[PDB]
């Protein structure tokens, strides 16, 4: 049959650890113990092979920096359970609190691995409190530390209530079970009470056994912590030293014991390919219609392009014809492969909750959905703010023009957050992105990986436009030079769209009027076409409301094209009668700084035409929130580092567009237009 | 002699040394508060008075609070501040304890034998434990901490300390904002712990000298003055660190911490003399003792520049006396300076003065060309207290203001930023009349440009980075310098043969030697010939770039009884140097940088291949628990945009650093093009 292993034995996990937390060492140690790419499949039957069946682990590689928010979001939808790794000395860093909140947004069950207990300043219970106070979750330690820093030897398994020491003989692969030292028995009982009390709340059956004063069994306690972890109500917290080889194996047992299988988490959410406002879902079952997400597009030197796909429902098989719901084009599934630690296992059937790499995919971009052509769905669409910043790139030679095209094409497949266009007005290639850093990365990879020699302009703000005056304009396009004529005529009432709405909200008020129905769509298409070219300074209108209330028709000269042009001419007059204003992208800035530099940051954000919002107070770090125009945030990283001696950190993301002041506006309006 | 108003024994040059987030600002603001009663204007050095928490001292001591940077990395700014302060008050968090970023400045403090006190701040916050941090100073910092206080109550229950010298509990009255305190008996729950640490305090003070050691071994109890005299001798010798504690935010302990400065930190005459070198010979080591009688020497440790206020040059007088109207020497620039008005920054006002004696600090107004790190001293017995080993700028960019109206304002701003940071230079290439700023790297220029926009309100655009090329010769040749002219009634005669050769590997500048002793060329003109070579060395000979080093020896020449003059020989010497382009076989040099990259083993290959692609030369690397260390020598011109490249290839997980190491002949590809442009 197509299914090879029960779904209950799958574990789609991702190690979520930031700079200086032990990501690389921990990931390399996992592939080591399991032995005795975007996604690696490994097997694990327990530290002591104490489990009846051999579980299949799909290690999903998560990004190192929160900077790219959609990259982190996508990885959290691919993994089912996450192993958040923190430094026992550094504790909870701000780059950890960011991915943690996004994890809550996708109800991602998770384990907390307090790594590096051998380094100085290491304190397990100290980091546990931060998860409860800062991250605001409910950590449930199932282990305690034995020895501090250089004297760290192992942990105490609160479920077995027996000390765990690691034998360096076989590189910490095995361990010995001794009794807990009397100097920690008192502390062990205290946290075992909180563990059992936390597991008892799982269901009524365990809660009643707890209130009766009956001691819960090892299986009952684990079943309780599991139900609460899968419900994201607690976080089994374990500890160890990946570099010293002490704790990793128990951390792999915890994945089986408390992280969920692809069928124990909520169904994947999606939308109808023909309607963005129609929400659908897919259950983790081989019987349900096929749906998969291309979460990563890598390059390989032996099989070529590798499109890594996460199958949420149905079965993906070689030879099957699936649909690319985002492009609306059919795809023929060819060879498929699963990346192992050392091997590269070829396969032809990938069932629900499993992951595999697809070979020879024509036109598949990261974030695209592969699904059944009879019952299609889009698992990831929009949710991306249009590019807020752009840079003009021009190749020095013709050889750079062809090479630049190939480079942006492949870079576009890996990163869908950036766009490319040719400015026919200046004949320069314009690349648009989410920020200065994002464009610097695209330009850097284009020069190093594709050898593209080119000149780049300074970053430009991706301005927009909108109207405020409600006015009625006449669209007229007439010509009859000879025995052939063209006739397009329509009166349109323009008005500002509601804040939040995108595109055009067109309304036909002359339903069954003199202007035939088949031309109405052409009038709408004509307005939308001019909205992209702009009306004030060549920038596109965010939204608009148009209503055709009158017009005329010619029995022989009227055609869809004549009305489309007529509608465009009426929209071009929206520059005077509309009283349009230039809009600029505003970013939601959040700065974490010691109380000492709060004033310097507040004054600087205010200087950047920023709008200060309510600020919070965190452990030894004030949280300063503000809404600042992107154009005033160029080089903020450098400014923040000077004013805070590199002690402060910040993050910003698009929030909305806002009218730019006259100072900037006037200059940009008279830059090319008038 | 009558210039001094306060004995030197009553001075205390102190600096609060605290890891970021240890209570440095709160502690410094509370010090200026208690000293003002026994907003506050910020300044590089603040002078305050303190006669004790209870005014228990006979004389009123003068405290010079030196503002220290506190960078996590040990920069030249931290080193300089340790030489300015005489005693340091190292502040640690009772909860955070001793962080590794503190162990770096601590060792550099040992390098300059800086006596110091340990103030364990924030005893009210959670995780606070005094004796816990004390052990870290002994285990991690490897020093000998001597607690003279113990904590009363932990965290939210923290009320005060126990003075082991007086053996009396100290509780602070919030009535007058912790300015006063009450002396009660030690609680029975800490009497046992108090005796234990008093034994270690007395035992640590007894080792001070033989007199106290013998009285201790005889079983005789040491008196209060004997114990304090012992801890003081040990602290000034940097053998112990009197450790005190408190909560600056809760106003409990700061006043006793000020008493400890008087009781255990040293006066400007109890620390070793300041070291230095002869301005004309870097291998000649000199020193200056803290005495008004010794020759004058001072260090400009900070230049406070403002876009509206006048520049303030803060100077630390180590020896002699600095007086208004005196003509001192700027041994680093070799230019005379006229001391104008001087002021000392107090808590609120600015007290004016005209005499700054040894061990004292003051701000100088209207200074012509005085840069951070320059030395001001006696013209007859000069000295350089700090060599500016800073390598000349390796990168440069053309800077243009967004509004041409800010051209004059931009020039003034870049000028003041150059006085604060001597690694940054500003010039106007007479060839284009464009403003060119030079620095140590792209990041360094970004910081200078950012500060110019925020602190000086001047926005500007920078062009693409340019390599700060240099030149050098390799051929040993003899060239004839000749400048002869006769306008008829007036003549000009300059003639001299010079033997040029490449300078010594480690020597910089010009090594001029006059070997035509008793020749036709009079001695009065030799200095002009030297000045002529040095002037042409800066203008370059191959592509308009300056020669790193050179050796010149005038071996022959001629002289005219009426037409010869210093200017004619200076020009003659320059013409001879310009011919170093053909006969010298000069080559265009480019700065090579020592690059160090810390990355997880995973991206080692990508970084090695990228450094090699940048014409880099890989060196032996190490394996640190924080990641693999990749070292390489790479031309700066190939390192532009490295920060961005490293972030792409390592997903921002890797970090790097680079510093000038040496100059190397640039490849023909670039050279040929630049050489042909100069003509």
Curated annotation (Swiss-Prot), chain B:
PROSITE patterns from the UniProt entry: G_TR_1, G_TR_2
One Gene Ontology term of the molecular function aspect: translation elongation factor activity
Domain tr-type G: 9-269
The keyword Cytoplasm appears for this protein: yes
Taxonomy, superkingdom: Bacteria
Swiss-Prot/TrEMBL keywords: Cytoplasm, Elongation factor, GTP-binding, Nucleotide-binding, Protein biosynthesis
Pfam families in the cross-refs: EF-G_D2, EFG_C, EFG_III, EFG_IV, GTP_EFTU
GO cellular component: cytoplasm
UniProt record, GO biological process: ribosome disassembly
Record-listed GTP binding positions: 18-25, 67-71, 121-124
Matching InterPro entries: EF-G-like_DII, EFG_II, EFG_III, EFG_III/V, EFG_IV, EFG_V, EFG_V-like, G_TR_CS
Coiled-coil ranges from the UniProt annotation: none
Compartment list: Cytoplasm
Keyword Cytoplasm assigned: yes
Stated family: Belongs to the TRAFAC class translation factor GTPase superfamily. Classic translation factor GTPase family. EF-G/EF-2 subfamily.
UniProt xrefs under HAMAP family: EF_G_EF_2_B
Functional description taken from the UniProt entry: Catalyzes the GTP-dependent ribosomal translocation step during translation elongation. During this step, the ribosome changes from the pre-translocational (PRE) to the post-translocational (POST) state as the newly formed A-site-bound peptidyl-tRNA and P-site-bound deacylated tRNA move to the P and E sites, respectively. Catalyzes the coordinated movement of the two tRNA molecules, the mRNA and conformational changes in the ribosome.
Name listed for the protein in its UniProt record: Elongation factor G 2
Source species: Pseudomonas putida (strain ATCC 47054 / DSM 6125 / CFBP 8728 / NCIMB 11950 / KT2440)
Gene: fusB
């Amino acid at each position: 049959m197509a299914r090879t292993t029960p779904i209950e034995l799958y574990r789609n996990i991702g190690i979520v650890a930031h700079v200086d937390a032990g990501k690389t060492t921990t990931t390399e140690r996992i592939l080591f113990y399991t032995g005795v790419s975007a996604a690696t499949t490994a097997f694990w039957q327990g530290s002591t092979k104490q489990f009846a069946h051999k579980y299949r682990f799909n290690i999903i590689d998560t990004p190192g920096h929160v900077d790219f928010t959609i990259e982190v979001e996508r990885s959290l939808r691919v993994l089912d359970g996450a192993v958040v790794v923190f430094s026992g000395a550094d504790g909870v860093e701000p780059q950890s609190e960011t991915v943690w909140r996004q994890a809550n947004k996708y109800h991602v069950p998770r384990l907390a691995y307090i790594n590096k207990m051998d380094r100085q300043g290491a304190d397990f219970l100290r980091v546990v409190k931060q998860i409860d106070q800062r991250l605001g979750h409910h950590p449930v330690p199932i282990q305690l530390a034995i020895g501090s820093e250089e004297n760290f030897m192992g942990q105490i398994d609160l479920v077995k209530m027996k000390a765990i020491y690691w034998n360096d003989a076989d590189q910490g692969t095995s361990y010995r079970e001794e009794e807990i030292p009397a100097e920690l028995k008192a502390l062990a009982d205290e946290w075992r009470a909180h563990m059992i009390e936390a597991a008892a709340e799982a269901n009524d059956e365990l809660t009643m056994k707890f209130l009766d004063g009956e001691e819960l069994s090892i299986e009952e306690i684990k079943a309780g912590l599991r139900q609460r972890t899968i419900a994201n109500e607690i976080v089994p917290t374990i500890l160890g030293s990946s570099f010293k080889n002490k704790g990793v194996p128990l951390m792999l047992d915890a994945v089986i014991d408390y992280l969920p299988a692809p069928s124990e988490i909520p169904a994947i959410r999606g939308t109808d390919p023909d309607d963005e406002e129609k929400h659908l879902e897919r259950h983790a079952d081989d019987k349900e219609p096929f749906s998969a997400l291309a979460f990563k597009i890598a390059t390989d030197p032996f099989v070529g392009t590798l499109t890594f796909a996460r199958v949420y429902s149905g079965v993906l098989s070689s030879g099957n014809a699936v649909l690319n719901s985002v492009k609306g084009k059919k795809e023929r599934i060819g060879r498929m492969v699963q990346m192992h630690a050392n091997q590269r296992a070829e396969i032809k059937d990938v069932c629900a909750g499993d992951i595999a790499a697809l070979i020879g995919m024509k036109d598949v971009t990261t974030g695209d959905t592969l699904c059944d052509m009879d019952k299609p769905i889009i698992l990831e669409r929009m949710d991306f703010p249009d590019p807020v910043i752009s840079v003009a790139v021009e190749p020095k030679t013709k050889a750079d023009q062809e090479k630049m095209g190939i480079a942006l094409g492949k870079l576009a497949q890996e990163d869908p957050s950036f766009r490319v266009r040719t400015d026919e007005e200046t004949g320069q290639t314009i690349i648009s992105g989410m920020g200065e850093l994002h464009l610097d990365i695209i330009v850097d990879r284009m020069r190093r990986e594709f050898n593209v020699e080119a000149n780049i302009g300074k970053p430009q703000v991706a301005y927009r436009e909108k109207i405020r005056n409600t006015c009625e304009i006449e669209g007229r396009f007439v010509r009859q030079s000879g025995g052939r004529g063209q006739y397009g005529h329509c009166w349109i009432r323009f008005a500002p769209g509601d804040e939040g709405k995108e595109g055009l909200e067109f309304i036909n008020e002359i339903v069954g009027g003199v202007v035939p129905r088949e031309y109405i769509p052409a009038i709408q298409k004509g307005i939308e076409e001019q909205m992209k070219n702009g009306v004030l300074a060549g920038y596109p209108l965010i939204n608009l409301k148009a209503a055709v209330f009158d017009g005329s028709y010619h029995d022989v000269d009227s055609n869809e094209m004549a009305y489309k042009i007529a509608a465009s001419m009426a929209t071009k007059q929206l520059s005077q009668k509309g009283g349009a204003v230039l809009l600029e992208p505003v970013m939601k800035v959040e700065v974490v700084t010691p109380e000492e530099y709060q004033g310097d940051i507040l004054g600087d954000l205010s200087r950047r035409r920023g709008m200060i919002q309510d600020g919070d107070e965190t452990p030894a770090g004030k949280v300063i929130r503000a809404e600042v125009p992107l154009g005033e945030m160029f080089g903020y990283a450098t400014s923040m580092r000077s004013m805070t001696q590199g002690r402060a950190s910040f993050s910003m993301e698009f929030t909305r567009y806002a009218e730019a002041p006259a100072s900037i506006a006037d200059g940009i309006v008279k830059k090319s237009r008038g």
